[PDB]
Design a binder for this molecule. Structure first.
Ligand SMILES: Cc1cn([C@H]2C[C@H](O)[C@@H](COP(=O)(O)OP(=O)(O)O[C@H]3O[C@H](C)C(=O)[C@H](O)[C@H]3O)O2)c(=O)[nH]c1=O
Lengths: 369, 369
């Protein structure tokens, strides 16, 4: 009854979409271009490549690792949605798991330094819940590790839950890495389905824009077949309906985010000093998006059960990916993750919470379990 | 001014789409299932798996060849959209080109017979413009070539332009092969973006539905994390907005298809016996969809130029895929394709043609070039 997630849809969407459908342009249209421009202006990076989902975005980005370009590994975290990691396999690269930092629920950057190898083609970091990874440390770790390597591996930030997040005052997508956002249904900015990739320079921008549509320069004369495909690609475009939904929702999203953060600040204050309730780390040099609010709790089943009876939806959200049969071969001991897997839990913190809803959650947690 | 392709959107779509938008259910909802059933009911095969585009349908289907499953090649035609063939490469398989039959613009089935090898994991045929491949022959040829092989290669039909097409009295999707359809913007039945895969049996249907959503059993409890992934998958689902549009347009597509065929029969009669204009083969035992109308013409550049001056859009549609740099290694001599590549051309034949528009095309072609 108090949901963990909710679709945020502008009341303007039904009208905007109706116009797009009657327009005669559903793909490769101007609405998607306009959306991309608007996103780019927000992030502070004009290099935005929209796609039909976040998983596609990662798939597209990782194709840079596999095919730069015209034995390889990707270092990644198992604590995330499978969509973060199966694109690694689809690109024909091996998964090597990096442990999780129990204080942030993000990648352990010291285990990373240990596991970076000449075989490392790419590194994927997930900003879990929109809590930014220490990108300065990440850059330092990658630089120290790959000093002689003759090519630096690709750093990919999975920003799927991280719309609105800032690091050192600037939005994610501006720190020199390839960043993938998701704009799926319950992401705070939604296009229905969709995502976009933000690139750090024009080469990556051009290359990913090409591979988004089969490697075909769309400015070419394909009416006579006078074009060449030098690098094969995928079919990952976002269509005019998505762009329309996105532009509408961009107008409302800053206010939703403000409510997420306000609700989170309320929890950090009120849930502090509760025995059996450990909160997630907080740094001064970043502003989390708080897509959901994380806690690490003793006796989690009793915790969730107690909150569920009080009408509060609660979830583990995802299984550690390293436990799936399909990646049995990459299975390795990750003690940090072991220490949080059975304790981590997510509670509603989003824009749909009223003042009383928020108190009810805190009061319910205070009633013990 | 007389366009070659046009978006077909029922005027009723806004209402249906609006319902989806007000539901809070944008992905994984019942509308897509309702659509899949309706398609299945028409095709006469219930094993329909919707996907977010036709290329993704092919990507997913070919994964059966690559990963059966829990060195390979694909025999395919180069006369087609690149979305047909790049999924071969995304699945990590080799492309081997089969020549084209210059009368049908489809695969030379005798050339196919010669190139089938123990290395063939799959065979891809395209029903170019919705003119059906002789599937009976394809089956006999595959069956004869692979007699001892201990596993029959996967047979995949690209039906992207073939909605409504019929072969030997039955719709495509009923002849025992895996069939992939597109419902992209200018295909005659559109979902905005989208496609679907039709399977010949329940094992393949279950498997593709699985890989459609990351290899996650959707009947499983993912809120407490009690699920396993045995076969990693992709993120290819069609969303509720696509399903809604598809349901609307299903109500109108039969009349649109009837107009395509009526215009094609008109051309067949009226364009016969024009010097420099060779038409495509027509068999009695199939009913083509005529997404566009094919001609093979002397001096194609002067031809297209002449019709452009009369306000008639005209196109080669796609480059022979075998000429692309990205696949330089698979380049092989294809004399049949050589014989038509510079002569093939497409002229408007769709449902938007007025009786006067249709006369104008015929009249223009007869004025010479
Ligand atoms: C996507 C789209 C196209 N059109 C018009 C515009 C063109 O005059 C004509 C073809 O459009 P486009 O530039 O997209 O053509 P191609 O790039 O060769 O590709 C199209 O035909 C090949 C075979 C594929 O397989 C593509 O999926 C399909 O997009 O139909 C519209 O009016 N609205 C639209 O949304």
């Amino acid at each position: 009854m108090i949901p963990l997630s909710k679709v945020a849809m502008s009341p303007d969407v039904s009208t905007r979409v109706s116009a797009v459908l009657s327009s005669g342009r559903l793909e490769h249209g101007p609405t998607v271009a306009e959306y991309e421009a608007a996103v780019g202006s927000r992030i502070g990076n004009p290099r935005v490549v929209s796609v039909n989902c976040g998983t596609a975005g990662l798939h597209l980005a990782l194709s840079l690792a596999a095919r730069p370009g015209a034995p390889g590994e990707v270092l990644t975290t198992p604590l995330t949605f499978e969509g973060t990691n199966w694109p690694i396999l689809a690109n024909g690269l091996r998964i090597r798991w990096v442990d999780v930092d129990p204080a942030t629920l993000n990648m352990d950057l010291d285990d990373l330094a240990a596991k970076i190898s000449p075989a490392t083609r790419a590194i994927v970091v997930v900003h879990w819940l929109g809590y930014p990874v220490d990108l300065n440390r990440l850059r330092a770790v990658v630089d120290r590790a790959t000093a002689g390597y003759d090519r630096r591996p690709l750093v990919v930030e999975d920003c799927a839950q991280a719309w609105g997040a800032t690091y050192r005052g600037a939005p994610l997508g501006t720190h020199g890495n390839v960043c993938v956002y998701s704009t799926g249904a319950i992401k705070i900015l939604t296009t229905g389905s969709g995502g976009f990739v933000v690139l750090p320079d024009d080469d990556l921008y051009d290359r990913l824009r090409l591979r988004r549509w089969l490697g075909i320069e769309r400015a070419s004369d394909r009416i006579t077949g006078d074009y060449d495909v030098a690098e094969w690609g995928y079919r990952f475009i976002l269509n005019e309906i998505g762009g329309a939904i996105g532009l509408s929702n961009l107008e409302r999203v800053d206010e939703l985010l403000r409510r997420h953060r306000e609700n989170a600040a309320f929890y950090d204050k009120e849930l502090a000093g509760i025995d059996g309730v450990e909160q997630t780390e907080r740094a001064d040099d970043r502003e989390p998006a708080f897509w959901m609010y994380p806690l690490k709790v003793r006796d989690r089943p009793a915790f969730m059960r107690r909150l569920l009876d009080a009408g509060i939806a609660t979830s583990v959200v995802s299984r550690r990916n390293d436990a799936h049969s399909c990646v049995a071969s990459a299975r390795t001991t990750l003690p940090g993750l072991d220490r949080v897997a059975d304790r981590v839990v997510h509670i509603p913190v989003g824009w749909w919470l009223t003042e009383d809803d928020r108190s009810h959650v805190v009061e319910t947690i205070k009633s013990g379990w």
